[PDB]
């Protein structure tokens, strides 16, 4: 019934033959048959399906209260699958104006070359979202909170816009995780995750997922999962599943630690602006409160003294690790403007060069606050 | 210098810090910075275990560049998307691997890519299939499951003449038996799931090239679409590769013995094996392959039912999909299938493993009756 | 500084060459040298030492505030090492009268055959512990709380007895974990863990550990770690480290869930007695409150209707899994009964309370009890 | 029936539920039961037994034509288990005078402290072996060929001496491997392997094994495997099984390559002596030919110019890697007198300081000979 329970129990039952309590790691590419096309348990070739991946898919679906789940080699592979399943040449996608850089790069640098068009919009403005919808729009791509500004989109509101124009709605739920936000309950057709981030939780397995309740959509995804073959290995699928068992517990601590870090930085003279969905003054706070169970582990801040101060903070932390990625037990810090591609100018919001992004981990909060205090001098 | 040596030694050098003789499994998605350490920033983009695997793959094909992927089909998908756009055309085999045909015909046609299937053995027919829009010729040799042979150097010349790239799917032969880049191909593809890994335990793919711009086009899609291998799997793939030369030699010896046994057996009408002088394309095979491989396909005298029953009755050959394993595998391909040749329903495909040959021949003799 | 912080950060620092944030899995049995004996990083042969095991040993030591750590293939292999390092033929060990059955088996069925003698004692009675000490006693083996009765031993008090008689004191800290109890700070010479249980946390890696501040004792352990070779593989050592990263967080929720389960069962008429260190009426509660930061995830109960009711409860739960072992995220349940040691009552059920939603756990027990 | 076939097929049968062709990696420490004691497949707790270890144990036993197999965390843990199973205080073991250094160190430095005694003997001299047997001798420890000197022992002859005096006979078959030598067929009671070496074959898993036909001895080993817990992880057990699949093929090439290296070195003026069981002049060559199917991958040589020449050869090779261990696909080289412990003096033969040990791998032979030629100057 509860999400912590499902994350542990759903989608692998102890094996009948051995009782093994955990899904085994099936490092087999192929599966013996009886008589010919007499499949055992439906298994025939690992890319097509294998038992470890099935277990992960069932756990993933369960924690989003979805009927169907599909696992991929990365978040980007899941995104690529979703785009290729739902779009064809001549179709259009509405996307966020501050999307995840990787998603933006895949759509702008790859899919435009295959005659897909897009329009970026401020997803917080429902009138703008609707206005960006054309007769060719087949998909609205929602991410909330966004990476790195933590902007908020009203999922139920956007889902209505999609229903009214026969466009599917996909929510990239990576930052919130299943633990904090359930987009299918709010009207989304499909949820995407990079399981590399909070679901795995340990910065040790790259992976993606798509979940849906629409059986025909799940079939379209399966055709590309099999056909194009961006599929996870079984050791990685096991590590993803293992991480997922502690997601609920970890997200609670992440949120608590992040709230403390946001309050500390909000009081600190080196900081001009704190971006955290739980702050009453954060734009979209009331939307976040309505659709999220907690406000997450991500905090971004803008430095009063500019790009140099941002770079200095990133350089001087000793517990926050200066590295890309997010959603790990270990705190991570980065300066996102350093990752700017020239090409995004005009099509995506400029990430301010005074901004630092903090992925607040589950270390003792006093040590995290002390690290930031010393780093800031 | 020798290929067995390179498989073992090229690519990963024992580590400076520890001397570990094998490439470590870096189960890390991200890398602390100072600039980067070692050039690593985020594992999808690059990581040390995949770098090692890519360097070993490139070394065994005498290629400057290698890219590793989550499967053979992901490597194919990367190749098609890097080299084609809407409005372009690809010449393909008339008896291509079913997964490659399915991807091109069921997915890429929907993105305004066109194709023409051709008997690759007929160079005049290959040339005639080339249009002004043809940007790629897709070569597989020997083909899966009919073991037909394509003249790589002759097709390479056709590509050069019409400014079309030539890709060779070298899965069946492997780098130990065939080196398409030395024959003019622009890119080589492998399903490393098969002979490179060798043990039916890791799904993986690879693209290797000498063309730096083309490797960059591949990298853009490896990173951007993210069909990338995990580090335990890249380790297993590398591990397998260390015995490829030695395994392919025994595969080939065992296959030859199987082909001769089955040639002499009355239950069998036709034997398809590149090493038989009567096999169509044998002379081409002999010129471009160091050995004739581990795969043998046969046609049963008594038809489909005799094919089905042979597959059911072996006790050492395992009835399963896939190929290129230490363990012998057997399948009835027609049960897995105007745009491609019809695989005869009396055909059985044997992936002959490295078991003792006398046990394999005994297993076939009892199963055939 | 804080324990959750050290669990994540002490031990492995991101690699200088690559910055990898996690300790790599070094699946190498050997290491290239620069000239004969020019070692790289000290590494020469995996059984003797390897980078993934080093990383795990540093993490394990850090979380016990210990100078030295050693990792083994299982908890029992750590135990075997400790016994072999600290005893010889003719020596004696004082042991708990309700020790972990594996430990008792190893000592009674193997080490007695090698002319080591033992005396079982109620560790809660310090006079009895002291009286059990002979001139040949070299080791006092403490476990607290015990498996499965959750009896408590005063570590500091036994430490004093060990000091007074030149006997070393080992504490098996598996049930409490480093997150709840720090025996080296109370005077123990050595701490043992089965990392199979809470430290790994996910019922997916078998492993053991010894930690100490005594460099000489660590050397004696190292000699047998290398020489008898009961050493973990690197995938397993990585899984153990990964688990450790969430230990503090998990033990908090284990303790909360367990307290709720104990209260529920204490109120239920099918239950005669509840064994949980956190109950004020539990024998040894005050000692537990002094030496433990929290009361753990284990609960044992005695059934009013006896052995058959204990069997039935174990069979009828759908969230608690009927299986051996303990200290996993997933709740586990078992019927332990199924002159040298206390007899475990055949009406007793042992619950390893996991981290699932507490309302689901209480509902599972309610339905199973009928 | 043939050994290559058994190595691939014996032990693990493709799974009934899924048909997986390979033994799955069961990363579970525990197994669900049906009602209390209703075990599934006999599994209860992983240290006691687990499906991946079972599969390995079955494969190991099959390749030695043995009824019983037991897998350990290392060769040394297998040795420890054998000694503890078969000896008690007051008992005695006859050992080689030139044993593997690890085996000797365990017996001399650990077991002597537990009141076990030993006598080292030239195993090639059956009279001497017999004379070393006392009323308290419970075990004769045979290693052939020995590490590093490649001396040969007559297994059948020594088995007879053990039968005559009711002492068990153990053969450490690590260097020959099951592909080249089958000691149970020659009368041994137990065979030990470090599977770290040729069976794994890839210098990537540490492991050990004991195999026997005596059910009571296998029970005594199980008691200590379970009780003292020196047991392999499932990943490592899987890698050991994977390596075993190619053992027969590898050992053939190792033997071919080694013979070529021994011939090259025998003709080279910098080399005084070549130690290889296949040379007709090697002491014990006729015994080796009688009991071994091939002469193995190890070659040791003595350098005419002494210790410094031995050190130089080891430092100057670029294909042979200067590292410990042996039995890998990659060639390895070492100077064993640097690895020996001084306190063996008087109880073991001295390994001459002019000796180089070569573990000849499966690289191309021409490259291996070129490497030795350049390194020797
Ligand atoms: Na795989």
Residue numbers in the entry:
A (entry chain D), D (entry chain A): 12 to 388
B (entry chain C): 12 to 45, 49 to 351, 357 to 388
C (entry chain B): 12 to 349, 357 to 388
Describing publication, verbatim:
CGS is a transferase and acts in the committed step (the fifth overall) of the biosynthesis of l-methionine. MetB is covalently linked to the cofactor pyridoxal phosphate (PLP), similar to other members of the aspartate aminotransferase (AAT-I) superfamily of enzymes. Similar to other CGS enzymes, MetB forms a homotetramer, with each individual homodimer creating two active sites. Here, we present two structures of the cystathionine γ-synthase MetB from M. ulcerans covalently linked to PLP and bound to the buffer molecule HEPES.
A second structure contains PLP as well as a highly ordered HEPES molecule in the active site acting as a pseudo-ligand. HEPES is bound in the active site with the sulfate head group pointing in towards the pocket and only 3.1 Å from the ∊-­amino group of the PLP–Lys208 moiety. The HEPES molecule is bound by a series of hydrogen bonds from the homodimer, including residues Tyr111, Asn158, Ser336, Arg368 and the PLP–Lys208 moiety of one monomer and Thr59 of the second monomer. HEPES is only found ordered in domain A; however, all the other monomers contain a well ordered sulfate at this location, suggesting that there may be a poorly ordered HEPES bound in each case. The only noted change is seen in a loop consisting of residues 350–362, in which the disordered loop in the MetB–PLP structure becomes partially ordered in the MetB–PLP–HEPES structure. There is no apparent conformational change observed for the PLP moiety in the presence or absence of HEPES. However, the MetB–PLP–HEPES structure suggests that the active site is likely to be blocked to binding of these molecules owing to the presence of a well ordered HEPES molecule.
